[PDB]
């Protein structure tokens, strides 16, 4: 049988474990590949506070 | 002194109020009268409306209602459970089988009335009595409890 | 639904059988296997997210906002019929004389042996009872006494709230039975005016 | 600081009491109390997280299994020489030498130390666990697996 | 359910009264509506320094 | 607790402060942040309440002596309790990781821990150890 | 002051537990086409009070063949744990307050076990263990759910903690399966349907029985407050009452499971799901 | 003796809590005295070293 | 011949009226030894001192859940030896009220089984319709449970006018009540997992174990006494037979529900076919006459005197008759010597036979399922202990 038949029979005979493993796989995949692609990309105290003021004052 | 007596009387009133309105019996599914008893706690009559809860143990049981015939083989067990009832306790006799034997009064293995084994406070007649009659009998039990005056007795002891 | 599933069987022999034999598949009463992504999602929605508890929950909740059948005894009573067999009672004639003539049919027919009768001729020559006792703690309220009596003397009255604190109060004598009959005569006569078309 | 020092002293008292009594249930109860009070006193050292870890683990997990094993394996054998055979004098004498007068203490030549409250950082603890002792964390994982597999292989069937 | 509705309202009212009373009592005790905030050793140090400074001010208050 | 050194009192000298600390009021915003102190007093109060409720029915209830009134009317547990032990220890291991801003290699090591955990757990699953027929 | 605050917390707990059992009775009646307690006081607004006073005046009976000290203390211990849990709910500032309450709830298992060994009842001996094993098994999943919750609990200073006042004032729409599994675990923790198979206090009586029920319903309310704080985005009376209403709703509509059945369910469906969700939340929150 | 057990337990607890501190403080007194003697001996040693070392 | 030696396991399951002693090697039941007789009232010997009419109320309290069915078997056993034909209208009334009684027995049984399992709502819900049918009983016999309505040659009284109206009105919504009853357990995974594949019974064992009623039907067995050995007007009635093939508690549950459906169908058919005519057999020498007839005729007065004192004399002989009881097959063996009292009256109870299956069925099960076994067995100790 192909992937489809075995997956169907397994999920019918045991859906919870397949759900758990699929969620784990999605998390692992997002950590490994998805995240480092689209979301991954000495000043003194006065500069930091000035930047904080600039960010806060407009909002 | 009169004020202390008045306080004693009011406390007795409150004690009777509490004990009457929260009587928890124990279930002896002996015979016919239990079905009337089961229907008495049902939606139409709502024994629970009158502060009545059936408990699995004698230890929380307040009084005993005998719903069904009592045999000689069952009498020691009934005395066992009643002797497990804590004080203050009462007994309610429902059904002629429980009353005096009734339709098995001349049998060889039937205890002619549960009176012969345990004391009884309320005798409810009928074979079977109406669930309405059981309501009336338990209300009369409440009336008997109302007339009780324990701390009044104890203060004059 | 009434369908069955693998793993939902509550045993070990059957569970061990179905996880190691496809015998349940041959059974048509078992829900058939999902065949596509849609059916798999339907099965997942069936198992997870409940969706079976939800229906009974909703029906019970509708019952919460629903009406009730509860009655407020003693300020409300139930429904009963004239044929009701309650407290035994002794009836008289409208002039005032006892209906019972001590034919002892009631005692003869009573399978409870709860009726004790003694009688002799009255000073006027009338055949009247000297002792008329019925053991209510022994009476089974069958009404066979009411069936046997040919003068409508003994009747089971519409009184059913007559519980006593002591058992001795239920040892009914002639006097208390006559008192009960004089009390409840009108209701019993009215019921007989209906029951006569059947009895 | 009377009560804090009293709680500190209670630890060794309970420790001796654990072996002192003959009822296994009493010993386990003493151990549970000792664990709780130990965690509470260590809380005075500023370890909120570690105290809860110790509490959770030992009370919820280990003591429960202790009581279960005892309850499935111990008919009362207290009179079975547990009171009639007594205790070895050499053991208590050695224990006195070791712990009452403590000829060989932990500090050795030092006789006084200052106890000072700490500052538990779960952030620093995590940094250490997963950056400085990650290898030991994996070794602990292997040890947990050893325990699980050995237990399930030593099953009495 | 009209019979249970009184109990339903009473439970909510009881919890409301209890929470309001506890709010008032703890506000009187702590004198700021943030005492439940998470605090590290830094905030603890600031709080204890401030308390000791208030005590020092009282000590120097009874000197003029 | 009461301070015993001026360094602990931030080098503030005087007698007023010592007595003030001696009879201070408890305040989370005062000197006892994260103190856990109300737990003990709650324990005392609950002990008192429970003891009183135990004692009271022995006072306001009649007593009668009866002989018969003084009478009462597996490894799956082993498996479950020992598994609970190990898994709770593992949860305690996991807890600090959830309380930090961990990094990617830290994440991978955590996943390694979880992988070993689930490996043992799944081995127990596949061998019939989670089927509680016994 | 602190003692007074403890008592001010205590009073609504007892009063409301009385009201909870009364309203559970009455709502069960409403869902059963009956009225329920209505004679004992105005609309039956006095039933639990008289019940408590009645069990107070009822005679406490002690077996002569066991250790009565544990028999007395076990309901006492459970009541103490309930009071301590309430104090930690309302009168605490611990950094791991949720973990504190979890560890507290882990302790309530003993009272059932203490009672089970105490009395000389074989079926108590068995049911105590059954209930113990159920709650113990579900405790791991509850801790895993808290682990998942702790992955986003941050204060303004930037430190990750378990403080209740720093929990977001919004519901967590992104953990609905986690919320559902946590709610079912809460249902399991209180011996309620569909986990009311185990009672353990069968040989108990009087105010001991009253304290057992007090501890049970207080733990139920504690878990309700925990759930409201965690998933419902705050702590309020409305949410407590709604959760209790839903719990009565579930009790009045479902039958209970078998022992090994909910054992299998918890050990093969709930804990692995919580583990996977915890891993996913940790991965995304990075 | 349930109440007897309670009495014995409480008596043991109180006696322990009042007696152990005395022994602890006796240990502290002995150690302080010994360290004072040690420091005096070391001071005398340093004095002798200064005398015979020029 | 047998010592005790190894005590080891010991159990006591309930003085409170079933006493059960079980044997487990742990969590799984290996032996189960019920002890009965706590309700043995010795009625069979008591019957010998009563006339046939006197002993009739004894049969009310043998199965106080289902009464008229208990009356019917004894009445038929009397009549067959008496060679008495029953009028058509009486047969209609008997069959209809028997169906109502069967409905009551099924309702109470299923509700008690649910409460033992853990469902409390259907209990309360179905007791309302049970109260309705109790009102029906009281209207026709003046007694809620112990009617003593069935008589040798007919019934005591005719139906009061206006009864069938309310019967039809009740039937107009009993289906809705049953439907709302099903949704609480039918589509539930919990109810099934509690009930599915618990206490499996085969056809061969069942016929070896003497099963009757719904338990027999759930084993793939085609059997109804109302269709194989019909009595009274049951042959005219057209209705279906539910059939299951697992011998499961869930299967028995569904079988009982479908039996209730078929009972409702028979109730409708009886309602729309009620005939006009005599309700008692015209033999006054066995059947009592009318009170009006008694009070104006010497012969009827004499017969009322004799029957109500001595009763009719059954010819010497023997017979056994059974009735398709809601709990199975209820039969009574009658031994006649020729007098006005039955010489020997043996009573056969289906629950007593079903109760004998506990030890073999409870093997391999769990303590959570013993209560399931008892509840699905549908046993009343009144008939079990006579
Ligand atoms: S009094 Fe009558 S109805 Fe009640 S249990 Fe006895 S025989 Fe049955
Ligand atoms: S009551 Fe009627 S039947 Fe009985 S003795 Fe009197 S007249 Fe005869
Ligand atoms: S009603 Fe029945 S038991 Fe009562 S007196 Fe009449 S015949 Fe006897």
Swiss-Prot record, chain D:
Record's GO cellular component terms: mitochondrial membrane
Enzyme Commission numbers on file: 7.1.1.2
Key words, A-Z: Electron transport, Membrane, Mitochondrion, NAD, Respiratory chain, Translocase, Transmembrane, Transmembrane helix, Transport, Ubiquinone
Keyword Transport: yes
Membrane-related topology note: Multi-pass membrane protein
Primary localization class, coarse: mitochondrion
Catalytic activity: a ubiquinone + NADH + 5 H(+)(in) = a ubiquinol + NAD(+) + 4 H(+)(out)
Superkingdom, taxonomy of origin: Eukaryota
InterPro entries: NADH_UbQ/plastoQ_OxRdtase_su6, Nuo/plastoQ_OxRdtase_6_NuoJ
Transmembrane segments: 1-21, 32-52, 55-75, 87-107, 129-149
Subcellular location: Mitochondrion membrane
Molecular functions per Gene Ontology: NADH dehydrogenase (ubiquinone) activity
Keyword Electron transport: yes
Family (UniProt): Belongs to the complex I subunit 6 family.
Function of the molecule: Core subunit of the mitochondrial membrane respiratory chain NADH dehydrogenase (Complex I) that is believed to belong to the minimal assembly required for catalysis. Complex I functions in the transfer of electrons from NADH to the respiratory chain. The immediate electron acceptor for the enzyme is believed to be ubiquinone.
UniProt-recorded name of the protein: NADH-ubiquinone oxidoreductase chain 6
Gene: ND6
From Swiss-Prot, chain G:
Molecular functions (GO terms): NADH dehydrogenase (ubiquinone) activity
EC number: 7.1.1.2
Record carries keyword NAD: yes
Covalent S-S links between cysteines: none
Location of this chain's protein in the cell: Mitochondrion inner membrane
Keyword flag Transmembrane: yes
Organism superkingdom: Eukaryota
Chemical reaction(s) catalysed: a ubiquinone + NADH + 5 H(+)(in) = a ubiquinol + NAD(+) + 4 H(+)(out)
Membrane topology: Multi-pass membrane protein
Protein keywords: Electron transport, Membrane, Mitochondrion, Mitochondrion inner membrane, NAD, Respiratory chain, Translocase, Transmembrane, Transmembrane helix, Transport, Ubiquinone
Bilayer-crossing regions: 2-22, 71-91, 98-118, 132-152, 167-187, 207-227, 229-249, 266-286
A GO-annotated cellular component: mitochondrial inner membrane
Any Pfam family the entry gives: NADHdh
Function per UniProt: Core subunit of the mitochondrial membrane respiratory chain NADH dehydrogenase (Complex I) that is believed to belong to the minimal assembly required for catalysis. Complex I functions in the transfer of electrons from NADH to the respiratory chain. The immediate electron acceptor for the enzyme is believed to be ubiquinone.
UniProt similarity note: Belongs to the complex I subunit 1 family.
HAMAP family hit by this protein: NDH1_NuoH
Descriptive protein name: NADH-ubiquinone oxidoreductase chain 1
Gene: ND1
């Amino acid at each position: 049988m192909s992937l489809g038949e075995a997956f169907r029979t397994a999920v019918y005979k045991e859906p919870v474990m397949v759900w758990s493993l699929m969620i784990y796989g999605v998390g692992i995949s997002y950590a490994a590949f998805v995240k480092p692609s689209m979301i991954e990309p000495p000043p003194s105290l006065k500069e930091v506070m000035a930047g904080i003021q600039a960010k806060l004052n407009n909002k | 002194a009169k004020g202390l007596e008045f306080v004693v009387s009011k406390v007795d009133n409150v004690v009777n109020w509490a004990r009457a309105g929260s009587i928890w019996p124990m279930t002896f599914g002996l015979a016919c009268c239990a079905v009337e008893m089961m229907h008495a706690g049902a939606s139409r009559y709502d024994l629970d409306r009158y502060g009545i809860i059936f408990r699995p143990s004698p230890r929380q049981s307040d009084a005993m209602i005998v719903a069904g015939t009592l045999t000689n083989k069952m009498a020691p067990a009934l005395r066992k459970v009643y002797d497990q009832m804590p004080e203050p306790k009462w007994v309610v006799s429902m059904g002629s089988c429980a009353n005096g034997g009734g339709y098995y009064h001349y049998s060889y293995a039937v205890v002619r009335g549960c009176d012969r084994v345990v004391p009884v406070d309320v005798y409810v007649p009928g074979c079977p009595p109406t669930a309405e009659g059981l309501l009336y009998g338990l209300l009369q039990l409440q009336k008997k409890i109302y007339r009780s005056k324990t701390t009044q007795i104890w203060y004059k002891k | 639904g009434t369908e069955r599933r693998p793993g939902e069987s509550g045993a070990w022999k059957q569970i061990e059988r179905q996880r190691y034999a496809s015998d349940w598949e041959n059974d048509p009463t078992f829900k058939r296997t999902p065949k596509n992504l849609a059916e798999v999602l339907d099965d997942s929605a069936s198992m997870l997210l409940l969706t079976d508890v939800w229906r009974g929950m909703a029906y019970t909740l509708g019952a919460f906002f629903d009406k009730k059948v509860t009655i407020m005894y003693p300020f409300e009573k139930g429904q009963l019929s004239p044929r009701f067999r309650g407290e035994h009672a002794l009836r008289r004639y409208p002039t005032g004389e006892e209906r019972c003539i001590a034919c002892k049919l009631c005692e003869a027919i009573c399978p409870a042996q709860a009726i004790t009768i003694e009688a002799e001729e009255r000073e006027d020559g009338s055949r009247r009872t000297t002792r008329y006792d019925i053991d209510m703690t022994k009476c089974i309220y069958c009404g066979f006494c009411q069936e046997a009596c040919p003068v409508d003397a003994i009747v089971e009255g519409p009184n059913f709230e007559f519980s006593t604190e002591t058992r001795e109060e239920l040892l009914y004598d002639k006097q208390k039975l006559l008192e009960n009959g004089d009390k409840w005569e009108t209701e019993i006569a009215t019921n007989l005016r209906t029951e006569s078309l059947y009895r | 600081m009377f009560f804090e020092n009293s709680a500190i002293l209670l630890c060794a008292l309970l420790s001796i009491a654990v072996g002192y009594t003959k009822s296994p249930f009493m010993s386990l109860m003493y151990s549970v109390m000792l664990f709780i009070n130990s965690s509470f006193v260590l809380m005075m050292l500023g370890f909120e997280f570690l105290a809860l870890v110790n509490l959770l683990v030992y009370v919820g997990a280990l003591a429960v299994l202790f009581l279960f094993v005892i309850m499935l394996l111990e008919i009362p054998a207290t009179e079975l020489r547990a009171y009639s055979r007594g205790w070895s004098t050499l053991g208590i004498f050695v224990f006195i030498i070791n712990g009452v007068f403590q000829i060989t203490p932990s500090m050795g030549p030092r006789g006084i130390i200052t106890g000072l409250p700490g500052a538990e950082s779960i952030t620093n603890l995590g940094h250490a666990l997963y950056l400085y002792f990650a290898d030991l964390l994996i070794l602990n994982s292997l040890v947990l697996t050893v325990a699980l597999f050995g237990r399930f292989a030593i099953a009495p069937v | 359910g009209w019979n249970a509705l009184p109990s339903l309202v009473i439970i909510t009212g009881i919890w409301t009264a209890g929470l309001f009373a506890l709010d008032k009592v703890q506000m009187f005790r702590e004198n700021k509506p943030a005492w439940a905030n998470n605090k590290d050793g830094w905030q603890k140090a600031l709080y204890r320094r401030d308390w000791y400074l208030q005590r020092e001010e009282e000590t120097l208050a009874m000197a003029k | 607790y009461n301070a015993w050194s001026p360094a602990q009192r931030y080098f503030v000298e005087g007698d007023h402060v010592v007595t003030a600390e001696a009879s201070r009021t408890f305040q989370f915003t005062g000197l006892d942040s994260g103190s856990f102190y109300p737990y003990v007093i709650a324990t005392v109060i609950a002990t008192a309440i429970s003891t009183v409720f135990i004692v009271a029915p022995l006072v306001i209830a009649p007593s009668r002596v009866d002989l018969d009134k003084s009478s009462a009317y597996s490894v799956s547990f082993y498996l479950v309790s020992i598994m609970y032990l190990l898994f709770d220890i593992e949860i305690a291991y996991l807890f600090p990781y959830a309380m930090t801003h961990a990094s990617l290699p830290m994440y991978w090591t955590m996943n390694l821990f979880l992988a070993i955990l689930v490996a043992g757990f799944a081995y127990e699953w596949g061998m019939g150890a989670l089927e509680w027929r016994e | 002051m602190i003692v007074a605050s403890i008592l001010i917390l205590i009073v609504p707990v007892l009063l409301s537990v009385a009201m909870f059992t009364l309203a559970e009775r009455t709502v069960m009646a409403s869902m059963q086409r009956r009225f329920g307690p209505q004679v004992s006081g105005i609309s039956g607004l006095l039933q639990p009070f008289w019940d408590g006073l009645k069990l107070g005046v009822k005679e406490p009976v002690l077996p002569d063949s066991s250790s009565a000290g544990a028999f007395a203390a076990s309901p006492m211990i459970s009541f103490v744990l309930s009071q301590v849990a309430w104090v930690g709910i309302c009168i605490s500032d611990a950094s791991f307050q949720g973990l504190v309450i979890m560890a507290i709830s882990s302790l309530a298992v003993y009272g059932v076990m203490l009672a089970g060994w105490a009395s000389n009842s074989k079926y108590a001996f068995l049911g105590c263990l059954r209930s113990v094993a159920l709650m113990v098994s579900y405790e791991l999943s509850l801790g895993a759910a808290l682990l998942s919750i702790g992955l986003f609990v941050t204060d303004g200073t930037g430190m990750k903690c378990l403080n209740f006042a720093e929990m977001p004032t919004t519901p967590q729409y992104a953990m609905l399966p986690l919320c559902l599994i946590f709610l079912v675990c809460i249902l399991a923790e209180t011996k309620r349907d569909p986990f009311d198979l185990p009672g353990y206090n069968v040989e108990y009586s009087s105010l001991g029985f009253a304290l057992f029920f007090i501890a049970e319903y207080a733990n139920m309310a504690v878990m309700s407050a925990i759930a409201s704080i965690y998933f419902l985005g705050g702590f309020s009376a409305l949410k407590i009452t709604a959760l209790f209403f839903a719990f009565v709703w579930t009790r009045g509509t479902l039958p209970r499971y078998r022992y090994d059945q909910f054992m299998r369910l918890g050990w093969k469906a709930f804990l692995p799901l919580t583990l996977a969700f915890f891993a996913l939340h940790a991965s995304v929150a990075i | 003796g349930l109440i007897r057990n309670i009495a014995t337990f409480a008596t043991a607890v109180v006696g322990w809590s009042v007696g152990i501190p005395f022994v602890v403080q006796a240990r502290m007194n002995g150690y302080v005295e010994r360290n004072l003697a040690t420091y005096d001996a070391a001071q005398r040693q340093k004095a002798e070293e200064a005398a015979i070392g020029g | 011949l047998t010592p005790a030696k190894v005590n080891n396991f010991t159990l006591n399951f309930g003085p409170q009226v079933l006493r059960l002693v079980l044997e487990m090697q742990g969590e799984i039941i290996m032996r189960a030894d019920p002890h009965i007789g706590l309700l043995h009232r010795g009625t069979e010997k008591l019957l010998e001192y009563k006339t046939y009419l006197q002993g009739l109320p004894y049969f009310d309290r043998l199965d106080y859940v289902s009464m008229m069915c208990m009356e019917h078997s004894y009445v038929l056993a009397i009549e067959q030896l008496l060679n008495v034909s029953v009028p058509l209208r009486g047969q209609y009334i008997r069959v209809l009220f028997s169906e109502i009684t069967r409905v009551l027995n099924h309702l109470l049984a299923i509700t008690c089984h649910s409460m033992d399992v853990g469902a409390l709502t259907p209990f309360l819900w179905a007791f309302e319709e049970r109260e309705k049918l109790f009102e029906f009983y009281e209207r026709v016999s003046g007694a809620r449970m112990h009617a003593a309505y069935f008589r040798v040659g007919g019934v005591s009284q005719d139906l009061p006018i206006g009864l069938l109206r309310d019967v039809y009105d009740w039937a107009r919504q009993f289906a809705s009540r049953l439907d709302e009853m099903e949704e609480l357990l039918t589509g539930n995974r919990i109810w099934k997992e509690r009930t599915v594949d618990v206490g499996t019974i085969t056809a061969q064992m069942a016929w070896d174990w003497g099963c009757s009623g719904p338990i027999l039907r759930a084993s793939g067995i085609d059997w109804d006494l109302r269709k194989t050995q019909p009595y009274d007007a049951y042959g005219k009635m057209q209705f279906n037979v539910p059939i299951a093939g697992h011998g499961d508690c869930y299967d028995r549950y569904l079988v009982r529900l479908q039996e209730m459906r078929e009972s409702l169908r028979i109730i409708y058919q009886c309602l729309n076919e009620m005939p006009d005519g005599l309700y008692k057999s015209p033999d006054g020498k066995v059947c009592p006459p009318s009170r009006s007839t008694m009070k104006q005729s010497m012969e009827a007065l004499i017969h009322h005197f004799k029957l109500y004192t001595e009763g009719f004399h059954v010819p010497a002989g023997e017979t056994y008759r059974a009735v398709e009881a809601p709990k199975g097959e209820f039969g009574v063996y009658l031994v006649s010597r020729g007098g006005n009292r039955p010489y020997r009256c043996k009573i056969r109870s289906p629950g007593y036979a079903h109760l004998q299956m506990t030890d073999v069925i409870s093997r391999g099960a769990m303590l959570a399922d013993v209560v399931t076994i008892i509840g699905t067995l549908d046993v009343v100790f009144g008939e079990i202990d006579r």
